Amino acid sequence: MPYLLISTQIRMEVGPTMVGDEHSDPELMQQLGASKRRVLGNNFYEYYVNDPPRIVLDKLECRGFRVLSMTGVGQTLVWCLHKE
Amino acid sequence: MPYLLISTQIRMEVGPTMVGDEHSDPELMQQLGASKRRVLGNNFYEYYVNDPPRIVLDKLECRGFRVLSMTGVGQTLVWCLHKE
Amino acid sequence: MPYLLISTQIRMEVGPTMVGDEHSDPELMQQLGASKRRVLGNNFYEYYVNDPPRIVLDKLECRGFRVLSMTGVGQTLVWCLHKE
Amino acid sequence: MPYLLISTQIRMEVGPTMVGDEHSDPELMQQLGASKRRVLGNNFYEYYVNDPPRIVLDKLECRGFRVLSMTGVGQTLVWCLHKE
Amino acid sequence: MPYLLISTQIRMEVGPTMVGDEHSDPELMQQLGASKRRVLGNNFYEYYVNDPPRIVLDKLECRGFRVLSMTGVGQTLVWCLHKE
Amino acid sequence: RPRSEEDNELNLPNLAAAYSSILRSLGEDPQRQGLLKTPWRAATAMQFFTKGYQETISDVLNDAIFDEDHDEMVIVKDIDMFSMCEHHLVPFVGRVHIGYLPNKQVLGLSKLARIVEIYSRRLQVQERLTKQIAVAITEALQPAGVGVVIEATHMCMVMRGKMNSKTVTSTMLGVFREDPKTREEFLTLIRS
Amino acid sequence: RPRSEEDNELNLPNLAAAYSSILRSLGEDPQRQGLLKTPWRAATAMQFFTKGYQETISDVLNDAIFDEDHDEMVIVKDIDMFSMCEHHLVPFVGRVHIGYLPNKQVLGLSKLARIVEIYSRRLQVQERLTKQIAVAITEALQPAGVGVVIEATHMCMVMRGKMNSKTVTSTMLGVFREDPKTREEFLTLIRS
Amino acid sequence: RPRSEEDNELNLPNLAAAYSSILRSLGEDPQRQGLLKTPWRAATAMQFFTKGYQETISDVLNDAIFDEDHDEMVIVKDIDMFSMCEHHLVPFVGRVHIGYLPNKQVLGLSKLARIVEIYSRRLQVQERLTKQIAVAITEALQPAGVGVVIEATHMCMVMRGKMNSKTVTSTMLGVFREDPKTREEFLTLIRS
Amino acid sequence: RPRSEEDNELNLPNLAAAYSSILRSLGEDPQRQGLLKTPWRAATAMQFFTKGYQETISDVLNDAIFDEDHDEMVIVKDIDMFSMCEHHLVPFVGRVHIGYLPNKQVLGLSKLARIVEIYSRRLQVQERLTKQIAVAITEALQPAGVGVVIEATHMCMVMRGKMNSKTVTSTMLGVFREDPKTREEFLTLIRS
Amino acid sequence: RPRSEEDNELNLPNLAAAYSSILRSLGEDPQRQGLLKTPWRAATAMQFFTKGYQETISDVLNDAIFDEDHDEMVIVKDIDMFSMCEHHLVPFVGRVHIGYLPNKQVLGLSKLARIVEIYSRRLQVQERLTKQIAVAITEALQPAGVGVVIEATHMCMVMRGKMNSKTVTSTMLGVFREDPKTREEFLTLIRS
Amino acid sequence: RPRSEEDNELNLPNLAAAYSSILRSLGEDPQRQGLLKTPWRAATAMQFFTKGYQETISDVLNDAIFDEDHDEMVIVKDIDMFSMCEHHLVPFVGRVHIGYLPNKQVLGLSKLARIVEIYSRRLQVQERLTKQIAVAITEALQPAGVGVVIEATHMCMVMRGKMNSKTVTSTMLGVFREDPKTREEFLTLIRS
Amino acid sequence: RPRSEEDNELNLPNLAAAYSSILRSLGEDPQRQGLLKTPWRAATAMQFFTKGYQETISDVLNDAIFDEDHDEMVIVKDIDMFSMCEHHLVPFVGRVHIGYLPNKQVLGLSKLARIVEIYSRRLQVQERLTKQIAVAITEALQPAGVGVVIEATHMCMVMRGKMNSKTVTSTMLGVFREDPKTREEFLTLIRS
Amino acid sequence: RPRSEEDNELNLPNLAAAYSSILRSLGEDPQRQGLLKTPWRAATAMQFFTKGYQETISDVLNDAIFDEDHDEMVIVKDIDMFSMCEHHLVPFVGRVHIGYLPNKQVLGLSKLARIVEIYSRRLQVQERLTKQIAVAITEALQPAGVGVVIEATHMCMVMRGKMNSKTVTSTMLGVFREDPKTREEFLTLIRS
Ligand SMILES: N[C@@H](Cc1ccccc1)C(=O)O
Ligand SMILES: N[C@@H](Cc1ccccc1)C(=O)O
Ligand SMILES: N[C@@H](Cc1ccccc1)C(=O)O
Ligand SMILES: N[C@@H](Cc1ccccc1)C(=O)O
Ligand SMILES: N[C@@H](Cc1ccccc1)C(=O)O
Ligand SMILES: [K+]
Ligand SMILES: [K+]
Ligand SMILES: [K+]
Ligand SMILES: [K+]
Ligand SMILES: [K+]
Ligand SMILES: [Zn+2]
Ligand SMILES: [Zn+2]
Ligand SMILES: [Zn+2]
Ligand SMILES: [Zn+2]
Ligand SMILES: [Zn+2]
Ligand SMILES: [Zn+2]
Ligand SMILES: [Zn+2]
Ligand SMILES: [Zn+2]
């Protein structure tokens, strides 16, 4: 599992920060302190964290990930990280 | 065929994920488990997968591709990968 | 002439693909099979191709270009390539 | 703290430039001459500077940061920098 | 002054191209043939050029800059270049 | 357990009695010719206004759900609705606007109406009424998304000054929540 | 004897009790956080709607009645009015239009408003409300004539199908009754 | 003899059969999933549109007729009405406007609505519908006069080119017929 | 095989018979002067409402398709349309709004109208009608994109309470589907 | 002798020729792809606009005239009409408003429409068109009176500056002429 | 070569002759007092409707083009326009909306009007008319962009059923084509 | 003697000179590029606004006056009219409404327009303009009566605070003056 | 140097003399009783229309500029404005819409009005008027941005055919120019 996708909305200096989908690594999610849930109406689960994206990026570096690309889409700011 | 383009819409933690066009490598498409189709009104075929983009990115790494750039356009999140 | 800019609109799996401006390399444009034109109302010429961007990216690699960045702006998906 | 996020709005050749969140490095913020504040209605603090983003990028290089990715989202232009 | 930001609007194959702000290097601006101005209503000066961004990117390479990232924001296409 | 016709018959006298009591407590004469039948008419009226309790989405679910293999937005707007303020027991009136992106399954107008009827005919709070209708449609069609907008006037507020003042609530699910374009199109096609 | 503030305080608990009973008889839980204070709010709301009982035209009479020695038609239209249907205890809303041919004595807007307030805030029947307002004005001014027109929508009818359906009543006294020209002019100057 | 619920049950199959036959005669496939239940839904719909046959003014007469000793014009306007053209069996829709000069006896909105419902839910002709409502009100109140106005759009004419074209019919009895002033006032008060 | 004029002549008697049967099943007298010719008038009317079955897009295709080498959005809005609900055989009426991005080929108003006529004059479902018109236009012009929007009122729903309630359906093909800007502009240019 | 279908076929070529000539006289090229079929389309269009010449009130007379023994005013308003100015051969458009006091005999909407159709689809003058329709109705019903009002916009005038300017004509026969009250009521019931 | 006054004088008789012929082919009497001068009035009218042929953008070009060194969007909306359908020679009427982003040069209202006049007063096709007006403005100002929107009703379609149905065409050049924000703003400022 | 085209050519320079003078007297620079041609454009504009002096009712009289032996009221309303206040030389704009009871002779729209044009394009006073139009029509038709109503806004008043304030004038001759019924009908048919 | 009250008194005669001359050049009699005072009234009127010259933004600047430390968009819409066309000296009228993003400093309605007054009461060109108002506001508040929209009707164009045709100009500075979101919001809040 070398690729990771995290994101935040509206403002970057505050969370929540989406850190995973239904098929994400349970350990990594746990290490990040992420919670799981399925928003009413949505057909999928998501892992989130209340930390600002910066914090999550630092934590992810410790686990061996590096930011490859960052982009905006809608009101969502997304980061694509790669491990090994 | 060194370049690849995949994408997803509205939300990143869930599919479908567009993985190819009419002139895409049949084997790779097969390896990904992609289906082919032409949406009514459109003048082109497309290969898609029900997996979330993260999954497809991991699978693509195994076949030798690396994410060069990720960008948002409209409500579409796109990834440009390169092999060799 | 180390830098190149190409783009496509609305959908990525089909052309046309814009591959050059009025001051683009005639040979490269020819090698790509691009046509030249000036849309009524516009004050500039443009070189385009009916191929999907993926095809153009592969052809460009053969001529020594590499994608440095890809981004969306409006309904236009753009690629910035670099040669040497 | 290897990752940094800065941004500016509407126009890039003039500030203000957001350089930090509530959990940012106080020393770095001070070195940049940033001010802190919490806009009425917002549930978070932010560090800003009146310099244009270019100036902030140069100053950040001196402290060991490099721009990894730049992206637009809404009317906000964001830079993701990495140190070590 | 290792970082540079240039941009263009609406269409990429034609200028003008913004190449600097009030605190930009006068020599570089001169080398590019940029003009300075302050649009009525704006509280800042800007350096622009009538060349298409492609031309400016080539000229910039000669002076030692390399494109690190390209992104779209609003109807503005932006390039972030780095020297040394 | 949903309310039953028996419950109504067994409770009518209790309601009637309460209203008769209310008439006296107001300073009126429950004996006036004009007030004689009032306790029953009032009780019956209130039972009608709350007849939504004696029903469930299930009674509607199965019935009419044809498959025209449709997969594009369907909207039904300007659906009149009448409900009761649960805080003052005074009615609030307005219109409901619905939209959904079908996943092959489409909803008949008759069923849609019934859904709105079930939840609006109860002691309510506008936001709850909005969510219940949206969720009910979501469960009856398993659609890609659904949106519900309600605008209403509250008599409990109007009869204290207002008749022009309106409250607007909405509930967006699925693509209606995640895709700003869908939400915009929906709000454009209804705000006519 | 007109209702007093003491009566309200003495009866509020009775009203609150009746409403708490009604909540149970409907199948609701008087314990829900959303219903806890409902018996009192409802009771308070109902007292407000019937506060017209605790007043009389006398309390208004004397006060503001200036003599501008005016002897030509005076009209006050589009006066919002809220009342309660005495048959179902559901409100009926609308507007009141008044006109009168003064015999030197003119009525202040403030007093006029109070007169409409006094009779509308009671359990009513549109025709009676119309007559009472008209007679009240007649007694307060001893005018050459007076006309009152009311158009309303009955919630008790609307919430059973109507919101557009309106009832119009009128009472024409004095010259407003005997002179067709005065009646016509009045209807012309209000039907704008 | 008025139509009965039994008649409906006994004739539903006959209606269903006729509609199934019509489907075939039109070139359609009564077997399509979308048409399977059509013969019954069509039959039920047609029975609903003609349910006025199973009622009489009598069933309404007695009930609600209070005496507020009122003797001035009462109007109820903008009453929605839906009927069926007896020549083509296509519906014609519109509004009904009623007015009457009571002779002490007043008619409740509920009963008024029922009277309009009884005659409009039949195979009709706008002029007959107008007269029947007028006479029904006359018999139920023995008033000094009554007026009924109906404006409608005929689908059978519209779906052949019209949607804006409207037929207006009226029936004026008693003082509504003999007194031009009463007639005028009535038309003024409804044509708003 | 499309319905033919012969089919109509051969089936008219069957239709007539069915309607005469329906008249009896409702409790009416097929002998009344007013009902005598109804079986035929109803049958003819029903054949008119479904005359779209005796046609195909082909009969329209070739005719008027001029090439003004136009490549920008063309819109024809507020096209009146009358159809029949296939579930109750009651008509649903409204307007159709069309837009397309020509690929050199433009469609004449006459042909456009005919296309809407062919599919609307059948037993329909609003969503199907919408898609059929969109696809017909696509096949007749091979355009870069097309959009169709229909808003309608269902009589089968109206005559059960509604006349204001409207259903909005849409079908977006090509650039109309993929480009949110084209979709927005289209909705802006029609929602006037 | 009314115009016949044969006449049209025999004259189409003459009309086509005249238009082809007009095209040349204007400076246009009758050969352009866009103009090739114009001579015939123009000729056909003009025959359509004047098809009222090939009919008479007789063809309509007998058919639909039911006797509901109605003797009160019947009104059909907002009837769209299109005609041609006999002076410039440019169309003038508008609405027709009809009213009549039946002497037992009533006119069906279908026949009414045809009457307006017959006279309006001719080279006309608004006042003649108005009288002809009124007289036609008089002869077909032998009514106590009839009124016709037409309001139109003349293209021959609009395309020379106007689109808002309107001409209003009327023809009042029988009681509509002699009784000001009948006339007033009619104008009241149509000017809505 | 543009049409000249001489051409008109030399062709009037040919036109007149053709129209007189048309009158006979329709079944009319060219001798009626009301038709005597029709051939000339028709001929003159048709020359007026096509007077745009005797002009060119050049005659307007030079004149009024002041330089207020303006570089922001200028809009002129609700410009009435009357044209002729080249397929049926029946007029199509509507409004033209113009917008442009000046490159220092601004266009006077007078000239703008003339430009619309020149192309609309010809045998036309809505799309062509739209493009010609846009291109003419582009040539007379060398602007950064321009947009033209036309909405119209086609008499040739209306007088065959429609008056409410409208065709909307547009031509977007320069920034109006390439910048969605400019296009949106333009459509926002005209769709008022 | 009516003003002639020669007079205009001979006086244009005098007018131009006056306006050039006015420009200086105001503090402006007659030399500005924007003002250079103003003296002539202003002079020409002022001659256009007063071109009614170079004409007489005679030039219109004979021409178009057909005899349809019509003897019922004919109305032409909402005729735009622009004039100049003779006191401030600032325009006052509005609408003219005309009605007449023909004595066999009818007036063409073209002539009517010309009559309004002749008198309004002069330095005027609203009441005179009204009377002149009425008298002109009377002389051109020898009718049984005629009515003219003008409603206008005065720019000389508006540009000093008003744009909503309107002046209404009327001139009633013949039956329009003596018969209150005719007058009422006229005002009813125009005040729409 | 701004115009002064002395200038007016010294130039009034000049203006009056010029107008007296104009009256003669038109063919009128400067002696008519109705014309005697016209030369001065016209001169006074023209001075009023151009009184904006005798003022400067400075006279307004200092006065009312309170600091409510406001930093969100402030809008003042539907500001009536009257100006003069510098090419024909005919007035063009309309509304001004202003918006600005304050940088702590806010502008009083009184001052805003005066700014619009200063520039509109001059010989103008709509685009200049628009820019001058925008720049004036910018200088008076040093705001983050400002937007100005003006829609007007030109009498010089209207009195030559138009009254409905409107010209819309805008000037967006600061964030109003650079941020499309701000611009959109502004247009949304004014286009009501
Ligand atoms: N909401 C910001 C953009 C943004 C979104 C999400 C994260 C960060 C920034 C804007 O409107 O410009
Ligand atoms: N729906 C997201 C954008 C998005 C699209 C696709 C993937 C991820 C995000 C938004 O509008 O904020
Ligand atoms: N049209 C896509 C965006 C897109 C544009 C161009 C290329 C690819 C995707 C959307 O609205 O989401
Ligand atoms: N005008 C492009 C966006 C764009 C801006 C700048 C450069 C290139 C493209 C669009 O609307 O899709
Ligand atoms: N405001 C710019 C986008 C932009 C935002 C922020 C910084 C720079 C540019 C536009 O709308 O085109
Ligand atoms: K966030
Ligand atoms: K997805
Ligand atoms: K593409
Ligand atoms: K900034
Ligand atoms: K550019
Ligand atoms: Zn409440
Ligand atoms: Zn009631
Ligand atoms: Zn019928
Ligand atoms: Zn149905
Ligand atoms: Zn004419
Ligand atoms: Zn045509
Ligand atoms: Zn004046
Ligand atoms: Zn001008």
B52, B12 contact by CB (below 8 A): yes
Among F98, F75, F74, F95, residue whose Cα is nearest residue F83: F95
Query: Rounded to whole angstroms, how far apart are CA atoms F90 and G126?
Result: 20
Query: Rounded to whole angstroms, how far apart are CA atoms E42 and M174?
Result: 5
State residue M87 phi and psi, 5-degree precision.
Answer: -90, -30
Cβ-proximal residues to J187 (8 Å cutoff; 6+ apart), any chain: J149, L185, L188, L189
Query: Rounded to whole angstroms, how far apart are CA atoms M138 and M147?
Result: 10
Query: Rounded to whole angstroms, how far apart are CA atoms L132 and K6?
Result: 39
Provide the terminal-to-terminal Cα distance of chain B, rounded to the nearest Å. Answer: 8
Cα dihedral across residues H114, H117, H122, H126: positive or negative: positive
Nearest CA in chain F to H33: F66
Which residues of H are catalytically annotated?
85-88, 126, 154, 156
Q: What class has domain G61-191? A: alpha beta
The answer to whether residue E11 neighbours chain K at the CB level (below 8 Å) is yes
Cβ-proximal residues to E83 (8 Å cutoff; 6+ apart), any chain: E1, E2, E3, E4, E63, E64, E65, E66
Report CB contact under 8 Å: H48, I159: yes
The D residues from 55 to 84 touching C (CB cutoff 8 Å) are: 71-72
User: Encoding tokens for residue D61?
Assistant: 């290089």
The answer to whether residue M16 neighbours chain E at the CB level (below 8 Å) is no
Ligand 3 pocket: which of B73, B77, B78 to mutate (most atoms <8 Å of CB)? B73
Query: Rounded to whole angstroms, how far apart are CA atoms F22 and F31?
Result: 13
Return the number of other C-beta atoms located less than 10 Å from residue K114's C-beta.
18
User: Encoding tokens for residue G151?
Assistant: 């158009």
Residues of chain I with CATH 3.30.1130.10: 63-191
Residues of chain L with CATH 1.10.286.10: 1-60
- The answer, yes or no, to whether F and H have at least 3 beta-carbon pairs within 8 Å is yes
Cα-to-chain-centroid distance, residue H124: 8
Strands F145-154 and C66-73: unpaired
Give yes or no for residue B76 CB within 6 A of ligand 3: yes
The answer to whether residue I179 neighbours chain C at the CB level (below 8 Å) is yes
| DSSP structure class, residue A44 | S
Among L150, L149, L167, L146, residue whose Cα is nearest residue L158: L167
Q: Which ligand minimizes its atom distance to the CA of E43? A: 9
Question: If you measure from the C-alpha of residue H94 to the centroid of ligand 13, how many angstroms do you get, rounded to a whole number?
Answer: 15
Among M191, D76, I149, I190, residue whose Cα is nearest residue K185: M191
Among L150, L146, L129, residue whose Cα is nearest residue L74: L146
For residue I157, the chain F residues in CB contact (below 8 A) are: 109-110, 113
Using DSSP's 3-state secondary structure scheme, residue E25 falls into: coil
For residue K17, the chain J residues in CB contact (below 8 A) are: 21
Q: Which atom of ligand 5 is nearest to the CA of E73?
A: 3
In angstroms, this model's resolution equals 2.7
**What is the CATH architecture assignment of J63-191?**
2-Layer Sandwich (3.30)
Question: If you measure from the C-alpha of residue D12 to the centroid of ligand 15, how many angstroms do you get, rounded to a whole number?
Answer: 64
Cα-to-chain-centroid distance, residue M128: 10
Query: Rounded to whole angstroms, how far apart are CA atoms C21 and I68?
Result: 29
Give yes or no for residue D18 CB within 6 A of ligand 5: no
Report CB contact under 8 Å: K177, C39: yes
Interface probe, candidates I126, I168, I178, I189, chain F, greatest F C-beta count within 10 A: I168
Strands B17-21 and B46-49: antiparallel
Using DSSP's 3-state secondary structure scheme, residue F51 falls into: helix
Of the candidates A42, A74, A75, the beta carbon closest to that of F174 is on A42
Query: Rounded to whole angstroms, how far apart are CA atoms F177 and F144?
Result: 11
Nearest CA in chain K to E9: K179
Binding site feature residues of F for Zn(2+): 85, 88, 156
H172, H153 contact by CB (below 8 A): no
For residue F86, the chain G residues in CB contact (below 8 A) are: 34-35, 38
Q: Whose CA is nearest to atom 7 of ligand 4?
A: E11
- Which residue matches tokens 């003399």? M17
Q: What are the angstrom distances between the C-alpha of D14 and each of D67, E10, E20?
A: 19, 21, 10
Q: Where are the beta strands (DSSP E) in I51-158?
A: 67-70, 74-85, 91-101, 104-105, 123-124, 145-154
The answer to whether residue E42 neighbours chain K at the CB level (below 8 Å) is no
F43, F12 contact by CB (below 8 A): yes
Cβ-proximal residues to F136 (8 Å cutoff; 6+ apart), any chain: F57, F115, F118, F119
User: I69's torsion region: left (phi>0), alpha (psi -120 to 50) or beta?
Assistant: left
Q: Whose CA is nearest to atom 8 of ligand 4?
A: E11
Return the number of other C-beta atoms located less than 10 Å from residue G134's C-beta.
25
Nearest CA in chain F to B76: F179
Of the candidates K14, K45, K160, the beta carbon closest to that of J90 is on K45
Q: Which ligand minimizes its atom distance to the CA of J88? A: 15
Catalytic residue from among L54, L117, L151, L156:
L156
Q: What are the angstrom distances between the C-alpha of A57 and each of A51, D41, D79, D81, L160?
A: 10, 26, 14, 11, 67
Report CB contact under 8 Å: M175, D75: no
Q: Where are the beta strands (DSSP E) in M67-157?
A: 67-70, 74-85, 91-101, 104-105, 123-124, 145-154
Give yes or no for residue I184 CB within 6 A of ligand 3: no
Go through the domains of chain C in sequence order and give each one's CATH number.
Answer: 1-84 (3.30.1410.10)
Cβ-proximal residues to I105 (8 Å cutoff; 6+ apart), any chain: I65, I67, I141, I142, I143
Q: What method was applied to determine this entry?
A: X-ray
Report CB contact under 8 Å: D73, A73: yes
Question: If you measure from the C-alpha of residue I22 to the centroid of ligand 14, how many angstroms do you get, rounded to a whole number?
Answer: 19
G180-190 and H180-190 helices cross at what angle (nearest 10)? 10
A22, A9 contact by CB (below 8 A): no
Q: Whose CA is nearest to atom 4 of ligand 1?
A: A10
B17, B40 contact by CB (below 8 A): no
Using DSSP's 3-state secondary structure scheme, residue K32 falls into: coil
Q: What class has domain F1-60? A: mainly alpha
- Which residue matches tokens 């600005």? M100
For residue F146, the chain A residues in CB contact (below 8 A) are: 41
Return the number of other C-beta atoms located less than 10 Å from residue G90's C-beta.
22
K42, K18 contact by CB (below 8 A): no
DSSP letter for each residue of E39-62: -TT-SS-EEEESS-HHHHHHHHHH
Among A11, J33, E66, residue whose Cα is nearest residue D75: A11
DSSP letter for each residue of I147-170: EEEEEEEEHHHHTT--TT-EEEEE
H53-79 burial code (b ≥16 CB/10 A, e <16): bbbebeebeeebebebebebbbbbbeb
Looking at chain F, list the stretches that DSSP marks H as alpha helix, in order from N- to C-terminal side. Answer: 5-26, 38-49, 57-61, 109-120, 126-141, 155-158, 175-178, 180-190
| DSSP structure class, residue G34 | T
Q: Whose CA is nearest to atom 10 of ligand 3?
A: B74
Query: Rounded to whole angstroms, how far apart are CA atoms K7 and H178?
Result: 69
Query: Rounded to whole angstroms, how far apart are CA atoms K59 and K50?
Result: 17
For residue G187, the chain H residues in CB contact (below 8 A) are: 185, 188-189
- L178 is a catalytic site residue: no
How many degrees, rounded to 5, is the angle at CA I92 between CA I89 and CA I95?
A: 150
Report CB contact under 8 Å: B71, D73: no
Among E4, J172, B58, J68, residue whose Cα is nearest residue A2: B58
Q: Whose CA is nearest to atom 6 of ligand 1?
A: A10
Query: Rounded to whole angstroms, how far apart are CA atoms M133 and M118?
Result: 9
User: M138's torsion region: left (phi>0), alpha (psi -120 to 50) or beta?
Assistant: alpha
Q: Which atom of ligand 1 is nearest to the CA of M181?
A: 11
Residues of chain K with CATH 3.30.1130.10: 61-191
Query: Rounded to whole angstroms, how far apart are CA atoms A55 and A74?
Result: 22
Query: Rounded to whole angstroms, how far apart are CA atoms M175 and L189?
Result: 53
- Length of chain M equals 192
Give yes or no for residue I34 CB within 6 A of ligand 3: no
Q: Which atom of ligand 1 is nearest to the CA of A75?
A: 5
Using DSSP's 3-state secondary structure scheme, residue L157 falls into: helix
Report CB contact under 8 Å: B73, C69: no
How many degrees, rounded to 5, is the angle at CA F79 between CA F76 and CA F82?
A: 155
Query: Rounded to whole angstroms, how far apart are CA atoms M156 and L44?
Result: 11
